[PDB]
Structure formats: structure tokens, C-alpha cells
Design a protein around this ligand. Structure first.
Ligand SMILES: NCCOCCOCCOCCC(=O)O
Ligand SMILES: [Ca+2]
Ligand SMILES: [Ca+2]
Ligand SMILES: [Ca+2]
Ligand SMILES: [Ca+2]
Length: 757
DNA sequence: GGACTGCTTACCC
DNA sequence: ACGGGTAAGCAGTCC
């Protein structure tokens, strides 16, 4: 299996290394046969020799086109001939672009921003993480004595925790009499031991939880301040702290640095992404957090460091266990997108998509269109019409059925051949004209995207057939990851079309996909309500909730199943309505906000406060209980009581602090905000105390008692103490518990005052 | 001082 | 990172 590709510079020329693992041994296959290329559309072939003269200096050296070649490719299908120009070293490719492009002869340059190492993986037709070889992994973690908003790394590391198949251990330089702790004499000593341990183990994967943004970065500032060669890489190198967008990411050349945090953050939904939280999520089992004030007083005291040791050891043990659980599917994704586990782990779907298309586009002799420059985002700023969202028949309904289109937007993209290279072409025999946008789509050749999108679904069903056959239950998991991922990639394509930053942007395509959607859902709804006696209680972009008012569950079921057999043959192409759910009763509140209880009893909840991270756990727990009341049982009494108790409990300051925490995200840099929400108010103050309030940072806070603007009383959850700081019982009763509860209890004509306290 | 209006977050699909 | 459609609430800005 190819772990990753990278290139060095031996004797001047670039050598592409293809880091692999065959027959239980890590190998580094070198390659100098590959040479970098770029593309350009010249108006006259005569100018090529004039353009070959173009020069540009990189550092001390002067650099010009090492070779040149007329290449016959395609572009949005249409055959185009263009000049592919080589270069000695890949780093010359980005020096000579602006000049070679500006040229008054040439119209444009193409494929000029594809990292060599990644170019080589695409072109050579190699796919990472193919074939079944066990890869050794090593989780690691650090405990720091971080002072009150001091410089990053100006505190020393107290412990380094590591865990793998066989053991968890702590390396530390204060004395702890425990079997899983190794005391070195000094900080430098315990790092040098850690570094040794990694070497002696020689793991393929290094698992961290936010290693990208803290653990590795901190180890550097230390190894810097202490003069220790921080050599973790197999080549003997130290880690490269590459800067991806808003944050950074760390690469250990020769090892897969698997930072779980971005994966966990992408995959699981939680209010807070503490390693303690995600263990309790993924595995159900609990985890104590030893806090900084706790660690430092243990260091300073020498009293009760054994807890801090248990914490370090647990931190690593849980990192490993999360790694061994998440790496598998993150590896299937390495293979599907055909780039390194590393890149894939940290990438947007936007990029994962573009990486797939570039690979397919090269294989398909298609000159990939260029990312849009600053000015070419500004024009793309115009939006388009989305999905149909019916205003719900509000209130409590019985015997409901969820009907939805199986893979709607892909079915449309497949069916109507919706693709930039099929959009309003000259003289196709047959054409498909989108319902309102109007745009005609050629129907004579399988369009680039529809082509690949079919292959994807084509395979996904193959993989689900191989699944029912699979004896080995591991493979059946690794198989299910492959199919589940393909579904997500396939469902990402419509999005990519509407994405201004997307190479294959096509507002014409996205708009047409959504247009068709609106047509098809409203036609089902119309058909379902007219032909069959159903009322549609609510609907939203490919999904419908419906009943036959005053009919038994038995009948609703039969008639819905009957309606599918009616409509489905009337629907065109891959477009197919499915019966997905039946629900004893259901409660539709506003658009995006409803709950339903199934026959077995499982209440499902959408959009309501209960499932929002930016609402107090007392708001949600209260709403969740008033909702159980109306749905699971019938007791609107039982409900109004659950409300009344929940309020008096808050009014009598008996409500736990923990349940009063409000989690919202700072989205951008604190200066850019036009308005100051309590969370910005709170985040702004924490920046006057030199805290790291950057994009993605979740602000937790409690509204303290008083009057005026809510943000002036908002103080962080950590910082809140019960002694001498009461919570705002008024706000918490009047602005959270009551408003949410009222939403559900409003349908039974209860005044907010009526809920009282 | 009550109602409009914009800002911001997170959800649904 | 990121598709559009939507419910909300906080906190100004009218008139
Ligand atoms: N994220 C895309 C916006 O949602 C549009 C709806 O797509 C859902 C695709 O159906 C899959 C479920 C099924 O097979 O019934
Ligand atoms: Ca549902
Ligand atoms: Ca289905
Ligand atoms: Ca998207
Ligand atoms: Ca958007």
C-alpha cells in the first residue's frame, strides 16, 4: 500500500519518493523519470518558440521552459489542442506562471497549481491505501503547565503520554510511583525518551487529538527552547507545520499523522468536542478531565500527581482507541478520492470532490478548468433557487408516512445529463430543458460528471452485493465504509456545481438540478393529494409527511404503498419515490421543526431546540420532556407540570450550573463582526486576557443575574463559580425554558404566563 | 417605548 | 472551507 508521495532535491534534480508498505516492511521507492508540466492556449503555433524564450528567476537561479509539446486534449468535452511546457524542478512551475500567462499572444494557462507529489499520484494512476497490510499506530498526548494566557510554549511539558496495541505509558520528570509512568530526570530527558520510544516502536501512523494545532506545535516551541532535534520522521526529519487555510496541519514525513479532531468534528455532532466528550459519545464509557489549575497545583505541590498521570495515560489510551476506530474508514476515503489519508483527513468535501475530478479528468484526457481568481469569485456571487419547503399543517397528527425520492439530486444529474460539458451545446439530436431556469442539456453523450456519478452509484450497489456475500465481518465493515462514503461523494456533486470556488462550477447546472427537484416533489404532492385522498402535513426538498385524516394505520400504510406503485412508473429516468417511515403520531411546528414517535416508541426530532447546540441543556431537556408528554403519552397536564417544576427549580436557584451552559461558535476574526452577540462580547473579553479566540472556537458561557444587554452579564462556564455569582433565573426561565416549551405547548392554547413558575 | 430590520448561528435536506 | 431555505434571538434603529 502506497502511504504517500513526496519529492526531495538530490544533486539539483527532483526525486519523487513513493512511501509504501509491502510484505510487513516500509519501503521508499524513488523516481526521477517524472517531470512537472503546465498547459497554455496559444493563438498561433508560431508564437510557441517565441514563448519558449520566457524567463523568470527563483532565488539565485534563472529558470525557463525545459521542454514544450503541442498536446491534443479535450475541454468541457470539445477537443482543444494546447502546449504542455515542462520545467527542471517543480518549484519553477509557480515562478514563471504570471509572466508566461500575461504574454500578449496567449489566452490562458491550465493545470498550473497541482502539487507535484499529488500530480505524480494522479498521472502514474496510483491509489493510496490499496491492499490489506496491517499498519502499526501509536497514539500520543502532552500535558503542559500553561499559565494565564502566556505565550504558546513558554510553559514546559510536564508529561508525554503514548498508547498502542500493547500498552499506555507516561514519560514525566516529577516522581510518580505508578507502573505506567517512567520518570526521566528533566523535561529534555522525557522528550528524548519519547523520541527514542517512537524510533524503537517505528509506527506507520501517529494518532493525535488536535495534534495539527497544539500537541506538535507545542513540542516544537519546547524542542526549540531546549535545543533537542525533534526528529520523528523515518527519513530522520523533524515535523513540517504546513499552513492549511485558517489553521495549520503537521506532517511527519514517512509516518501518517492522523489528527482525529478534524475527522471527529466532520463525522460526529456534539455541543463541545473535548476528547472526554467524544469518548463518552463513540464508546459510551466516561472520562474525568484533570484541568490546568489541577495539573499545575500537582506540579507545584507534588501532592496528587497520580491523578494527572492517570489523565495523561487515559488521554493517550482513548486517542489510540478513537484512532483504531476512525482510521479504517478514513483509509477507504484515501482510496476512493485517491489521495493520502493525511490530505483526505483534513480536506473539505469541496476539495475531496475536486481531487476526484482531476484524477478522472486526467484519465479522461480533459484539461481541468482553473480555480477562480479574486475577480472570478465576485461575478459567481449571485445565488439561485433551492428546494421546495411546504409550510406545515401545524399540530398533532396520527398515522403519518414519510415518502422521499431515493438519491434525488444524483438521479436528476444522471437522468437529465446535467453537466457543464453538456450545457446548451450546438446541434445535439435530443435535449432536456430544465423546468424554470430553462437551460437545455445535451442528451447524445454521457456528460463528464453524470458519467462518473453513474459509475459511483453503479459500484455502490456492487459493494452492497459484495457486502451480503462477505463472511469476514471486518471486510463487511470496510465494505460498508466504501459504500457509505461513495453515497456522500455522489450526494456532494450538486453542491460542488453551486460552489463558486469549485473548478467545475456551473450555476447553470446547480440551478437546473434544484429546479427539477421542485418540479418532481410538487408533482408527487399534487398527485398524492388529488388522485389519492392523502393530506400532506409537511414537505422539504424531496421528502413528504402525509396521512389520510381519520383512517387507521393499516390503511394509511396500504394506500401509501399503493400510491408508490402508481407514481413511480410515471416518474422519469432514475427518479423513484420510496416509503421510508410510518409514525403512530407526529407534531409539525414550523418549517424545519417537527417530531414523530414510531410504532416501537422512538421519538425522532428535527430542528426544534432539543437538537440545537446553541440552546441551554435545561431548555432542551425541558422541551424534550414536554415533547415526550404530548407524543409518547397524551398528558398535556403531565407536560404543563414538567414545565412548572423546571421553572420554580430555576427560580429557586436549585438548577445545576452545568445545565445552564450556552455553546455557540465564533465563525470569523473578532474584529470583522458588525454586531456584538453575548458570545462575541464574551470572546472579545477573553482576547483582552490573551486567550486563543480564533475561528472554530466554541464559546461556553452562563448569563449572570442583572438587567440591560445579555452579553454584559455573559461570563465563561469555566470562570463561573456558585459562591458570590448567582445565575440569571429571569433570562433562563423567560428567554429559554419557557419559549421552547411554549412552541410545543402553544398548539394546546397555553399562555406563557399560564406556565408561570 | 413598541415595532421594524438587520446580524448571526446552527439546522434541515 | 463549501448548496439554498429556514427559525430564531440579540441588539440597535426607527418614528
Ligand atoms: N445534501 C443534499 C441536499 O439534500 C437533498 C436530498 O438528498 C437526499 C438524497 O436521498 C438519499 C436518501 C434516500 O435514498 O432516500
Ligand atoms: Ca423523518
Ligand atoms: Ca433509500
Ligand atoms: Ca457541499
Ligand atoms: Ca451558502
Amino acid at each position: 500500500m502506497i502511504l504517500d508521495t513526496d519529492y526531495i532535491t538530490e544533486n539539483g534534480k527532483p526525486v519523487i519518493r513513493v512511501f509504501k508498505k509491502e510484505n510487513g516492511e516500509f519501503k521508499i521507492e524513488y523516481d526521477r523519470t517524472f517531470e512537472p508540466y503546465f498547459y497554455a492556449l496559444l493563438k498561433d503555433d508560431s508564437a510557441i518558440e517565441d514563448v519558449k524564450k520566457v524567463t523568470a528567476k527563483r532565488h539565485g537561479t534563472v529558470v525557463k521552459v525545459k521542454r514544450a509539446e503541442k498536446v491534443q486534449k479535450k475541454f468541457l468535452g470539445r477537443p482543444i489542442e494546447v502546449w504542455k511546457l515542462y520545467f527542471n524542478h517543480p518549484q519553477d512551475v509557480p515562478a514563471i506562471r504570471d509572466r508566461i500567462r500575461a504574454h500578449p499572444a496567449v489566452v490562458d494557462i491550465y493545470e498550473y497549481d497541482i502539487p507535484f507529489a499529488k500530480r505524480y499520484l494522479i498521472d502514474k494512476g496510483l491509489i493510496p491505501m490499496e491492499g490489506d497490510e496491517e499498519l502499526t499506530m501509536l497514539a500520543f498526548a502532552i500535558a503542559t503547565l500553561y499559565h494565564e494566557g502566556e505565550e504558546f510554549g513558554t510553559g514546559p511539558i510536564l508529561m508525554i503520554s503514548y498508547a498502542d496495541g500493547s500498552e499506555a505509558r507516561v514519560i514525566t520528570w516529577k516522581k510518580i510511583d505508578l507502573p505506567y509512568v517512567d520518570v526521566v530526570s528533566t523535561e529534555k530527558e522525557m522528550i528524548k525518551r519519547f523520541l527514542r520510544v517512537v524510533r524503537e516502536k517505528d509506527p506507520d501512523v501517529l494518532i493525535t487529538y488536535n495534534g495539527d494545532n497544539f500537541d506538535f506545535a507545542y513540542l516544537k516551541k519546547r524542542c526549540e527552547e531546549l535545543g533537542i532535534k525533534f526528529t520523528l520522521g523515518r527519513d530522520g526529519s523533524e515535523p513540517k507545520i504546513q499552513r492549511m487555510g485558517d489553521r495549520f496541519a503537521v506532517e511527519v514525513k514517512g509516518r501518517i499523522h492522523f489528527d482525529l479532531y478534524p475527522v471527529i468534528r466532520r463525522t460526529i455532532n456534539l455541543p463541545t468536542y473535548t476528547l472526554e466528550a467524544v469518548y463518552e459519545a463513540v464508546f459510551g464509557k466516561p472520562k474525568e478531565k484533570v484541568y490546568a489549575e489541577e495539573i499545575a497545583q500537582a506540579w507545584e505541590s507534588g501532592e496528587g500527581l497520580e491523578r494527572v498521570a492517570r489523565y495523561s495515560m487515559e488521554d493517550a489510551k482513548v486517542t489510540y482507541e478513537l484512532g483504531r476506530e476512525f482510521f479504517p474508514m478514513e483509509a477507504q476515503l484515501s482510496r476512493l478520492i485517491g489521495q493520502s489519508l493525511w490530505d483526505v483527513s483534513r480536506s473539505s468535501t469541496g476539495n475531496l470532490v475536486e481531487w476526484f475530478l482531476l484524477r478522472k479528468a486526467y484519465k479522461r484526457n480533459e484539461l481541468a478548468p482553473n480555480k477562480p481568481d479574486e475577480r472570478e469569485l465576485a461575478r459567481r456571487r449571485g445565488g439561485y433557487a433551492g428546494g421546495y419547503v411546504k409550510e406545515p399543517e401545524r399540530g398533532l397528527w396520527d398515522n403519518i408516512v414519510y415518502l422521499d425520492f431515493r438519491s434525488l439530486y444524483p438521479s436528476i444529474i444522471i437522468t437529465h445529463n446535467v453537466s457543464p460539458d453538456t450545457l446548451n451545446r450546438e446541434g445535439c439530436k435530443e435535449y432536456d430543458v430544465a423546468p424554470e431556469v430553462g437551460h437545455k442539456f445535451c442528451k447524445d453523450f454521457p456528460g463528464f460528471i453524470p458519467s462518473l456519478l453513474g459509475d459511483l452509484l453503479e459500484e455502490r450497489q456492487k459493494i452492497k452485493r459484495k457486502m451480503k456475500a462477505t463472511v469476514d465481518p471486518l471486510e463487511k465493515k470496510l465494505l460498508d465504509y466504501r459504500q457509505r462514503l461513495i453515497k456522500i461523494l455522489a450526494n456532494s456533486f450538486y453542491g460542488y456545481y453551486g460552489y463558486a470556488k469549485a473548478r467545475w462550477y456551473c450555476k447553470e447546472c446547480a440551478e437546473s438540478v434544484t429546479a427539477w427537484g421542485r418540479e418532481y416533489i410538487e408533482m408527487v404532492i399534487r398527485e398524492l393529494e388529488e388522485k389519492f385522498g392523502f393530506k400532506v402535513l409537511y414537505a422539504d426538498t424531496d421528502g413528504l409527511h402525509a396521512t389520510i385524516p381519520g383512517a387507521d394505520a393499516e390503511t394509511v400504510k396500504k394506500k401509501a404503498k399503493e400510491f408508490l406503485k402508481y407514481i413511480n412508473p410515471k416518474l422519469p429516468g432514475l427518479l423513484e419515490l420510496e416509503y421510508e417511515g410510518f409514525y403512530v403520531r407526529g407534531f409539525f411546528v414550523t418549517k424545519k421543526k417537527y417530531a414523530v414517535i414510531d410504532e416501537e416508541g422512538k421519538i425522532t426530532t428535527r430542528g426544534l431546540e432539543i437538537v440545537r447546540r446553541d440552546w441551554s441543556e435545561i431548555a432542551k431537556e425541558t422541551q424534550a420532556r414536554v415533547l415526550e408528554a404530548i407524543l409518547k403519552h397524551g398528558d398535556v397536564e403531565e407536560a404543563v407540570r414538567i414545565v412548572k417544576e423546571v421553572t420554580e427549580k430555576l427560580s429557586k436557584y436549585e438548577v445545576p450550573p452545568e445545565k445552564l451552559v450556552i455553546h455557540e461558535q465564533i465563525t470569523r476574526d473578532l474584529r470583522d463582526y458588525k454586531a456584538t452577540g453575548p458570545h462575541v462580547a464574551v470572546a472579545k473579553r477573553l482576547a483582552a486576557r490573551g486567550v486563543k479566540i480564533r475561528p472554530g472556537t466554541v464559546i461556553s458561557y452562563i448569563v449572570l443575574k442583572g438587567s440591560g444587554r445579555i452579553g454584559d452579564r455573559a461570563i465563561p462556564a469555566d470562570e463561573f463559580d456558585p459562591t458570590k455569582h448567582r445565575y440569571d433565573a429571569e433570562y433562563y426561565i423567560e428567554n429559554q425554558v419557557l419559549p421552547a416549551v411554549e412552541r410545543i405547548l402553544k398548539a394546546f392554547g397555553y399562555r406563557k404566563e399560564d406556565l408561570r413558575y
